[PDB]
């Protein structure tokens, strides 16, 4: 409904994502139909940037108050599951630290803090 | 508004009759309906 | 010496297995000595005798 | 003095404000070295972390057990009383009489049934 | 998760579908059919202009079902990596339960083929009921249900090398090759010699050959959506989900007929 | 119009369970009811309520079995357990298919309508649960009843399958970050093991019915032995759903218990993998077995010898959960909550149920106690005290994390003990019944039985008022529920430990294994905007 | 044989076919009292010993000789169970020269009874049809629901084969004594065999649903000596 | 214009303001008839469903 | 009984398969031993007997299946794969011959051979590991092993619980010298060729294709157990009727086209339905090349069933002695689609040769 | 797998590096919940390290532990025998002495 994106630092919503026609007697592209949630996937592997992560926790080091393991999190809000150090060691606990506490989970002992982006 | 009573289709405070009425009559319909096929067949067959 | 305790759990454990086996087959050792055979002889009796009227 | 005798009577009337100046000045009673403290304090301490009171109470308490049992009493009584009045209210068949039921016995009896354990039609 | 404007989108690739009325309607149409075909063939009705509106409304929610499924993955545009995914596990998971309900209907021809009762002089196709004849029509249909799954690769095989005339007409005749396998499957049954109730050989020929027509019927109309929904520019080189599932379709009713030619027109 | 948009045009998947609950207490009301109106005439010798009408006797023990088994178990089991909890409980938004969801709810209201229009319309469809075929003709029962019966049968069904393609789906590809499909919580296993057999068993029921409806009114002579066929073959098509369906009943219950077993008694369950290696042999080894239903049907000697032990095999798999969730329970602290009760009450009663059945699983011994009283003794200790308890202890754990008001524990223990009582007095002397010779589905009986038969029907009267007492328990439970939670420590979800102090208990209060217990009082409707993380 | 008022345990038996199914369920029964008692201990030893205790052992979860344990000695059971069910699966029939044959076909609500031997040059078969006696027209000391107005008379100590089958629906021929009971479908002939070993009278009753009247269908077996039976079936 | 309104629908169904199935102006031909049919089906069984339980035949 | 001999041959078959697929060159060593084997086997049944190289030949794989858990190393391994092929041979052989034996009636001998036949592609579905990684792997194998010995009790109490001659000829020299036998081998050889061949190629020109996933790749195959299954069963009963050599024509015919469709797909759904035409197919010749050639042994020669199963034996393990290293050098050299289109071509132009089946020559 | 003689080791490590109270409470926790019984020169540690926390009923509720997880009571008199010095320094009272 506005201007069209070229690459993803020039994307401010969805209105940068509806994209040129094709051609009158041509199988058209996904460079030139995509709109919604799937050109933005689309001009994002164009590039090496994967829009979805899938990579779990850190599991290499532990945590002190004053050193906390930083999770970052879009709301107030994140649920954090610890299985221990070695990374499968102690057993699942899940932990909602906030941005006014820490979790601490009550076996290992880690403290996880909230990066609010 | 999200709270404790915000997800039941039906309201239970601040109300014009009072909720004892429609926690009664779901028990009633639903421990008098199979009686009233019996009385149906029953009196749809001679006997009584 | 009387400060050094290792092994008390499995103790209980293997107690608790060697005794609700003895008490399940004594619960059991009586449903097939005072419940079955003597029915078995009394009938075997019953049969032994209303034969030898028959006989005489 | 006062603040402390005496704890395990008080606690759970005082308010939230009240609570946290007690705590908060037994925090700084215990880091002087031990030995230094009075009784009281040493019994105030133990009361406020490992006492039962808060989230420490009992599931059942003593008035509850019996509250329970002459709930159920009373609902075994009721049952009882309901079933009676459809018990005198019954179709009663010919059949099932005393005087029928030692009929059947002598015919039971001529041709020779359950030879072992037993043969009765008397239940009144 | 540290693009610059992220927030502006949403965090995860799934589809929260919005609120419509079609699960209630299809459920009051099924309703309205379910008891009108139950009193209709017992009286209480009288004329026959009930049910079939029952089955025209049960027809037309499935077709608004799908109006609303089409218009949130061609312009709204919410079908990323994993909602096509899911919806492929979802058809295979379908697909399945739709070939079991065949696996019955096969027990139940081996369970009277091989131990006839004493009723029916113990032999298969019965006297006084001749079979239909395997090297005739029957045959036919065969050959044009295995011209059609070559029909419909070419189709497949033209949409991803960017031709466009060349994947209507390979739907156009594929379309036209299901028409014809109704017409023979038609003129199959007006010229036959033994009906439903003359044996327990014309119960579940007329049962196994019957729900394959209904199911055939199907693949005419997802055709036709085919085809009409290229014409009109929706698919793309490596975007398009309708048809790899009447291409999976197509397949498996092949595979059941190439089954039901040997143990019911053969086999006697 | 808010109104409409959110509980009639729904997509979210927590909206729905309620609606599934609702309509269960529905449907298991009326089924108590009828079914105290059968111990009510089956108490003395004669015809007592029912004056002398066989049939509307029939009819009610059809009648009975239906809103039990697909109108109360399964919605509640499937729909108000199972759609509320997965998606919480694997860290995902909504469903993958909500309008499926939609449908599978809205597809039971018009069924319930067509069953109790099936008891009205003529004298009655009197075929028992099992519609054999040579009765449920056009000769015994002629009219519109068993038709609007067996559709009842199959808009349940077409529920039942989107409903488990929905679930298969959802768990496979909606998952958080680092959950693989070994980490899954049991109950998840349980859904989909359940889900799998859903897929692989509703087929041919449905084939079954509908060849029953196609002989009865298109007189296509399947099952007519005058034509050349045998109806024996309607058994073998009915019988493949019917011993599935009763494991369907049962697994998502087992699931239930293990969170229980791990709560209140603070341990990890023993071996999960043992449980869910287990719940995957019970479910394969009960899709080969379906002919121990038919033993007196004339089959030949060399097919009983395979279904005796083809039957006993799915008792070592059960005997490791069992001795699992002993094992779970035996170390750890344990604290008698309501929840608790039910799971003892559980591992018990379960285990008398179903040791009868390897009792009946043997050829030589069913000519002993088929259409007898004892099967009925069997199925009620697994089905009425298996399922029903199980249901019980779901509904009083996780009450409080959907809705955010506390119940009156006192009235909830009076009500387990009343309901214990009840069903153990009223299941047991069927046992004696069956051995001295009782047969199944008669009003009037010999003057011989009736001694017992009026003490099984004094515990129905005591459960009914268990029943009464579960309704105001729920009215405490809405209103003034909020003033609830200072009465009794059964409020808090886990016990401070031996040397946690109660200051640093209340600042560090929930420690869970799951999401379920770490969500805000009432869960919020979208719950999760950013994705969870694992390790 | 009669049911008794406060039953709790088989009839009397007076055919070996009986005696065989009583000790077998006799012989399963020790097994499954020996289960029952072990799990009961173990809940009573869970409640009296660990019941909210200090000490939570939340690190014994793996075990592997104990694991191996549960899934051996409960297979021992099931064979040493299934050795004799299946001898006598095999064992009991009719091996050697069945002595009568009686057909028992099943309408809708009485039983119709022929004798396929004692056949004249004519086709002079004796047959007869049994019903059930009504409460209004019972004698003092009669059974109510279990007697009826003809019965069928045998002999004992010699091998009686029932043939039945059905005309109406699907029925079930049960003699709970003599430890008989098939079904009546309306295609089929089944069959089997029965020896008693002592006179008197033996009631059943039928099993499968059948339709409105399906609590008055009794059967009832007189087991007569042989002059009786030679006298009796010069009568009818 | 062309074949190609692709580019002006995604315009439209996106900022519309109406729910999916009632934006463009054409569903009052679809949704009319369905509605209005949909109350007359199931008025129908209705009145031969009650008319049924009180032995009436037609 | 006549049940026991059928219920070792389903065992014994099922064990070999699920023996064959422990997760764990090494494999091709397997099969050549056996066909080393398999016509020595066929000797012994003339002389020394039946069960007595049934049993030593059954309790080597489970000295093999030890040899498999307990040891690591190349050599142990190596050791662990081979004395597979000796104690399969001799099964597969012996209970072969017997159950031919014991089954005398042409229709009886055609069903129990299917049903048993069954047992292959059963295996690698009711249990794919054997003795596995996790222990719990001996909780899922666990309640089969007490179904087995459950079921095994059924034919041992009926047998030596209850109700209670020798020949010699068939020199397998002479018998090689008949055309209808070689025939039967070569259409058994054939067939397996196919299967051979395409099993371990596909990963990798799926993986070239589509960048296929792991569990896509585990997850394409599998539909042909279960077309094996089907089609073993049913044509086991079905075949009589029709004559075999009808069957076994149209089996090769259908596996040959389906082998041919493969290349043309181009995604798994694609690739569902020409791998159940396949299995379909195998099981189509098998189940009708098995039971023919005692017919014909009986027709033309002395009935003595060593020699001639020995020799079908050898055709079956032919196939999977040679053709995997053959399809990997085909492979990378030709191309995956000129390899399935060279055998779909050679497997329909052996399809004429079965019409000299259907009526052979008297004796 | 553990030995006595590592577990006396590591559980003594865990208790010289705790640097607040809720660390200290963790640590005593995971160590009784085990078949060992903790020896007395791990108690020695953790007494001091409820000293440099400052707290004083973990103290009291420690030696509260050893009467419930001791077998028999000469076991716990003879534990009260060889912590006896670490407690007359310290200022420790054992629950019945205070009767709190
Ligand atoms: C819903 C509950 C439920 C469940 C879970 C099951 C599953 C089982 N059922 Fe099923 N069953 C029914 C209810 C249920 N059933 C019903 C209603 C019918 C049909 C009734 C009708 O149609 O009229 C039926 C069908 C049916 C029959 C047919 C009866 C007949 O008509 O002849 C039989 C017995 O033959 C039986 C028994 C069993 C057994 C043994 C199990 C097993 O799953 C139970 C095994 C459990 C144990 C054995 C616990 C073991 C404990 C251990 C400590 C292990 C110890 C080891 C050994 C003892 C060796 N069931
Ligand atoms: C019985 C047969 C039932 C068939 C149901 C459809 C089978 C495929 C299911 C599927 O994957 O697609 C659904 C569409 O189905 C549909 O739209 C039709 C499903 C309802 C058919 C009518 C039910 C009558 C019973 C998705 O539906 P969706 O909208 O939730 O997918 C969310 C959109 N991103
Ligand atoms: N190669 C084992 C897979 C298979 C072959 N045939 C049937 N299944
Ligand atoms: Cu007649 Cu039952
Ligand atoms: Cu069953
Ligand atoms: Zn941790």
């Given at each position: 409904q506005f201007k069209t994106a070229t690459?993803?630092?020039?994307?401010?919503?969805?209105?940068?994502?509806?994209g040129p026609g094709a051609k009158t007697g041509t199988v058209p592209t996904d460079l030139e139909q995509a709109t919604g949630l799937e050109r933005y996937e689309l001009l994002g592997k164009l590039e090496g940037i994967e829009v979805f992560d899938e990579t779990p926790l850190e599991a290499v080091r532990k945590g002190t108050m004053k050193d906390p393991i930083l999770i970052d999190s879009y709301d107030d809000y994140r649920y954090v599951g610890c299985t221990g150090v070695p990374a499968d060691s102690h057993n699942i606990e899940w932990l909602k630290p906030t941005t006014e506490k820490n979790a601490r989970c009550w076996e290992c002992g880690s403290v996880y803090k909230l990066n609010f982006l | 508004d999200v709270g404790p009573y915000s997800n039941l289709p039906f309201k239970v405070k601040?109300?014009?009759?009072?909720?004892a009425v429609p926690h009664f009559l779901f028990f009633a319909i639903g421990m008098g309906i199979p009686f009233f096929a019996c009385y149906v067949q029953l009196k749809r067959s001679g006997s009584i | 010496s009387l400060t050094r305790i290792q092994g008390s759990v499995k103790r209980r454990i293997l107690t608790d297995i060697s005794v609700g086996l003895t008490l399940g087959f004594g619960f059991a050792s009586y449903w097939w000595w005072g419940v079955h055979k003597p029915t078995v002889a009394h009938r075997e009796n019953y049969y032994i005798e209303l034969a030898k009227k028959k006989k005489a | 003095n006062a603040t402390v005798t005496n704890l395990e009577k008080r606690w759970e009337d005082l308010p939230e404000t009240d609570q946290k100046d007690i705590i908060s000045q037994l925090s700084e009673r215990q880091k002087?070295?031990?030995?230094?403290?009075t009784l009281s304090e040493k019994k105030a301490a133990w009361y406020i972390s490992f006492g039962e009171w808060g989230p420490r109470?009992?599931?059942?308490?003593?008035?509850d057990k019996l509250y329970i049992f002459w709930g159920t009493v009373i609902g075994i009584v009721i049952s009882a009383t309901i079933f009676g009045a459809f018990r005198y209210n019954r179709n009663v068949?010919?059949?099932?009489?005393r005087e029928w039921q030692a009929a059947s016995d002598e015919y039971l009896k001529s041709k020779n049934?359950?030879?072992?354990?037993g043969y009765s039609q008397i239940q009144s | 998760m540290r693009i610059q404007n992220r927030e502006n989108l949403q965090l995860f690739p799934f589809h929260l579908v919005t609120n419509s009325p079609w699960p209630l309607t299809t459920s009051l149409a099924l309703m309205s059919l379910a008891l009108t075909l139950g009193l209709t063939m017992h009286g209480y009705?009288?004329?026959?202009?009930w049910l079939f509106l029952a089955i025209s409304l049960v027809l037309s929610s499935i077709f608004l079902w799908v109006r609303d499924v089409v218009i949130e993955g061609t312009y709204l545009g919410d079908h990323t990596i994993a909602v096509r995914k899911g919806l492929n596990i979802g058809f295979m998971l379908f697909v399945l339960s739709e070939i079991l309900i065949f696996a019955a209907l096969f027990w139940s021809y081996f369970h009277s083929a091989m131990?006839?009762?004493?009723?029916?002089?113990?032999?298969?196709?019965?006297?006084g009921i001749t079979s239909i004849k395997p090297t005739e029509l029957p045959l036919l249909n065969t050959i044009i249900l295995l011209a059609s799954g070559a029909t419909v690769t070419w189709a497949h095989h033209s949409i991803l090398y960017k031709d466009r005339q060349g994947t209507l007409v390979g739907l156009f005749i594929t379309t036209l090759l299901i028409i014809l396998f109704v017409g023979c499957q038609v003129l199959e049954y007006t010229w036959?010699?033994?009906?439903?109730?003359?044996?327990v050989f014309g119960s579940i020929f007329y049962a196994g050959t019957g729900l394959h027509f209904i199911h055939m019927v199907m693949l005419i109309v997802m055709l036709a959506i085919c085809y009409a929904r290229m014409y009109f520019y929706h698919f793309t080189s490596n975007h398009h989900l309708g048809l790899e599932t009447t291409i999976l379709y197509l397949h498996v009713l092949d595979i059941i007929w190439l089954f039901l030619y040997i143990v019911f027109y053969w086999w006697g | 119009m808010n109104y409409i948009n959110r509980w009639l045009f729904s997509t979210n998947a927590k909206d729905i369970a309620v609606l599934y609950f609702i309509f269960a207490l529905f449907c298991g009301l009326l089924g108590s009811i009828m079914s105290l109106i059968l111990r009510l005439e089956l108490?003395?010798?004669?015809?007592?309520?029912?004056?002398?009408?066989?049939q509307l006797f029939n009819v009610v023990a059809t009648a009975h079995a239906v809103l039990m088994v697909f109108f109360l178990v399964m919605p509640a089991a499937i729909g108000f357990f199972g759609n509320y909890l997965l998606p919480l409980m694997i860290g995902?938004?909504?469903?993958?298919f909500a309008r499926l969801n939609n449908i599978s709810f809205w597809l039971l209201p018009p069924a319930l309508v067509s069953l109790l229009a099936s008891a009205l319309i003529?004298?009655?469809?009197?075929?028992?649960?099992?519609?054999?075929p040579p009765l449920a003709g056009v000769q015994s029962h002629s009219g519109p009843s068993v038709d609007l019966a067996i559709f009842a049968l199959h808009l349940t069904s077409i529920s039942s399958l989107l409903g488990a393609i929905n679930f298969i789906t959802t768990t496979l590809?909606?998952?958080?970050?680092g959950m693989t499909m070994?980490?899954?919580?049991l109950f998840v296993w349980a859904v989909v093991f359940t889900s799998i057999l859903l897929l692989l068993s509703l087929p041919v029921l449905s084939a079954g019915v509908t060849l029953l409806l196609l002989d009865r009114?298109?007189?296509?002579?399947?099952?007519?032995?005058?034509?050349?066929?045998?109806?024996?073959l309607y058994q073998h098509l009915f019988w493949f759903f019917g011993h599935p369906e009763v494991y369907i009943l049962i697994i998502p219950g087992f699931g239930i218990i293990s969170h229980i077993v791990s709560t209140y008694s603070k341990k990890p369950v023993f071996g999960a993998i043992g449980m869910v290696y287990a719940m995957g042999s019970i479910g394969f080894l009960?899709?080969?077995?379906?002919?121990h239903h038919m033993?007196?049907?004339?089959?030949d000697v060399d097919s009983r010898a395979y279904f005796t032990s083809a039957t006993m095999v799915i008792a070592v798999p059960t005997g490791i959960k069992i001795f699992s969730w002993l094992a779970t329970l035996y170390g750890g602290s344990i604290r008698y909550t309501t929840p608790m009760l039910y799971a003892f009450a559980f591992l018990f009663l379960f285990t008398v149920g179903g040791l009868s059945g390897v009792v009946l699983s043997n050829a030589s011994l069913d000519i002993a106690f088929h259409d007898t009283y004892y099967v009925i003794g069997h199925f009620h200790y697994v089905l009425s005290l298996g399922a029903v308890f199980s249901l019980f202890a779901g509904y009083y754990y996780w009450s409080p994390l959907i809705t955010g008001l506390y119940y009156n524990n006192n009235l909830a223990n009076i009500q387990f003990w009343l309901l214990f009582i009840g069903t153990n007095v009223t299941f047991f002397p069927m046992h004696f019944l069956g051995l001295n010779g009782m047969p199944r589905r008669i009003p009037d009986y010999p003057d011989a039985f009736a001694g017992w038969n009026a003490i099984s029907s004094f515990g129905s009267l005591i459960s009914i008022i268990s029943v009464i007492l579960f309704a105001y328990v729920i009215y405490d439970q809405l209103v003034?529920?909020?003033?609830?939670?200072?009465?009794?420590?059964?409020?808090?979800?886990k016990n401070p430990d031996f040397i946690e102090s109660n200051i640093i208990f209340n600042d560090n209060s929930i420690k869970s294994s799951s999401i379920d217990f770490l969500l805000?009082?009432?869960?919020?409707?979208?719950?999760?905007n950013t994705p969870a993380i694992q390790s | 044989d009669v049911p008794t008022p406060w039953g709790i345990f088989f009839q009397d038996s007076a055919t070996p076919n009986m005696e065989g199914i009583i000790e077998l369920h006799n012989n399963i029964m020790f097994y499954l009292v020996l289960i029952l008692t072990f799990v009961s201990y173990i809940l009573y030893t869970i409640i009296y010993n660990?019941?909210?205790?200090?000490?939570?052992?939340?690190?014994?979860n793996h075990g592997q000789l104990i694991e191996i344990v549960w899934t051996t000695l409960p297979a021992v059971i099931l064979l040493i169970i299934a050795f004799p069910s299946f001898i006598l699966l095999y064992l009991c029939d009719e091996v050697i020269s069945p002595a009568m044959t009686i057909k028992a076909i099943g309408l809708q609500w009485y039983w119709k009874y022929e004798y396929?031997?004692?056949?004249?040059?004519?086709?002079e078969i004796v047959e007869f049809e049994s019903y059930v006696i009504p409460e209004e027209l019972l004698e003092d000391g009669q059974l109510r629901l279990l007697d009826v107005d003809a019965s069928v008379v045998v002999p004992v100590d010699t091998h009686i084969r029932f043939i039945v089958s059905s005309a109406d629906v699907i029925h079930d021929f049960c003699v709970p004594a003599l430890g008989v009971k098939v079904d009546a479908s309306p295609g089929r002939l089944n069959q089997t065999s029965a020896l008693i070993q002592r006179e008197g009278v033996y009631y059943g009753q039928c099993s499968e649903l059948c339709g409105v009247?399906?609590?008055?269908m009794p059967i009832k077996i007189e087991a007569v000596s042989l002059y009786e039976f030679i006298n009796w079936l010069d009568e009818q | 214009t062309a074949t190609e309104k692709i580019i002006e629908l995604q315009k439209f169904y996106?900022?519309?303001?109406?729910?999916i199935y009632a934006?463009?102006?054409?569903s009052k031909y679809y949704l009319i008839p369905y509605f209005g049919l949909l109350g007359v089906s199931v008025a129908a069984t209705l009145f031969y469903t009650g008319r049924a339980c009180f032995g009436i035949k037609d | 009984s006549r049940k026991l001999i059928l219920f070792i041959v389903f065992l014994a078959l099922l064990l070999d398969n699920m023996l064959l697929t422990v997760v764990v060159l090494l494999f091709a060593s397997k099969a050549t031993v056996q066909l080393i084997t398999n016509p020595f086997i066929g000797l012994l049944t003339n002389?020394?007997?039946?069960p007595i190289p049934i049993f030593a030949g059954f309790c080597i794989m489970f000295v093999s299946t030890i040899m498999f858990a307990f040891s690591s190393s190349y050599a142990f391994l190596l050791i662990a794969r081979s004395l597979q092929g000796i104690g399969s041979s001799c099964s597969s052989v012996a209970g072969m011959g017997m159950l031919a034996s014991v089954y005398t009636d042409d229709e009886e001998r055609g069903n129990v051979m299917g049903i048993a036949l069954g047992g292959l592609a059963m295996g690698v579905l009711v249990?794919?590991?054997?003795?596995?990684?996790?222990?719990?792997f001996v909780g899922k194998t666990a309640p089969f092993l007490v179904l087995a010995a459950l079921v095994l009790l059924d034919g041992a109490i009926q047998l030596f619980v209850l109700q209670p001659e020798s020949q010699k000829g068939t020199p397998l020299t002479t018998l090689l010298k008949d055309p209808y036998i070689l025939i039967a081998a070569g259409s058994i050889c054939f067939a397996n060729m196919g299967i051979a061949m395409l099993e371990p190629a596909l990963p990798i020109w799926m993986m070239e294709t589509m960048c296929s996933r792991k569990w896509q790749l585990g997850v394409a195959f599998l539909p042909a157990s279960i077309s094996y299954l089907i089609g073993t069963n049913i044509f086991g009963i079905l075949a009589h009727k029709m004559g075999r050599w009808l069957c076994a024509l149209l089996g090769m015919i259908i596996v040959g086209v389906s082998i041919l469709c493969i290349?043309?797909?181009?995604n798994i759904y694609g690739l569902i339905a020409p791998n159940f035409g396949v299995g379909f197919a195998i099981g189509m010749v098998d189940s009708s090349m098995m039971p023919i050639m005692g017919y014909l042994v009986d027709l033309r020669h002395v009935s003595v069933y060593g020699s001639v199963y020995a020799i079908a034996d050898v055709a079956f393990c032919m196939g999977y002695a040679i053709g995997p290293s053959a399809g990997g050098a085909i492979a990378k050299a030709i191309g995956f689609p000129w390899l399935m289109t060279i055998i779909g071509i050679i497997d329909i132009l052996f399809?004429?040769?079965?019409?000299?089946?259907?009526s052979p020559p008297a004796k | 797998e553990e030995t006595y003689e590592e577990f006396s080791q590591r559980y003594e490590k865990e208790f010289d590096e705790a640097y607040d109270l809720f660390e200290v409470q963790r640590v005593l926790n995971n160590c009784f919940s085990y078949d060992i019984v903790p020896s007395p020169a791990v108690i020695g540690k953790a007494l001091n390290a409820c000293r440099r926390v400052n707290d004083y009923a973990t103290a009291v509720r420690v030696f509260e532990g050893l009467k419930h997880k001791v077998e028999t009571k000469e076991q716990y008199d003879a534990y009260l025998e060889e912590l006896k010095d670490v407690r007359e320094e310290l200022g420790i009272d054992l629950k019945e002495e205070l009767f709190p």
């Open positions: 690459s993803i630092a020039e994307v401010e919503g969805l209105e940068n994502l509806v | 601040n109300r014009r009759v009072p909720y | - | 002087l070295p031990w030995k230094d403290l109470r009992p599931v059942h308490t003593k008035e068949p010919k059949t099932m009489n049934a359950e030879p072992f354990t | 009705i009288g004329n026959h202009l131990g006839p009762t004493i009723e029916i002089g113990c032999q298969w196709p019965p006297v036959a010699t033994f009906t439903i109730a003359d044996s | 108490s003395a010798p004669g015809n007592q309520i029912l004056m002398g009408n066989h995902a938004s909504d469903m993958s003529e004298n009655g469809a009197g075929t028992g649960w099992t519609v054999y590809n909606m998952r958080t970050i070994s980490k899954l919580p009114n298109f007189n296509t002579s399947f099952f007519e032995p005058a034509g050349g066929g045998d109806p024996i009960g899709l080969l077995v379906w002919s033993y007196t049907v004339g089959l003034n529920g909020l003033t609830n939670k200072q009465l009794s420590t059964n409020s808090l979800f805000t009082s009432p869960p919020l409707p979208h719950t999760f | 660990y019941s909210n205790a200090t000490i939570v052992h939340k690190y014994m396929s031997d004692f056949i004249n040059d004519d086709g009247m399906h609590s008055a | 996106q900022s519309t303001n109406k729910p934006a463009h102006p054409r | 002389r020394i007997g039946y249990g794919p590991p054997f003795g596995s990684v996790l222990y719990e290349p043309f797909a181009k399809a004429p040769l079965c019409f000299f089946l259907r | -």
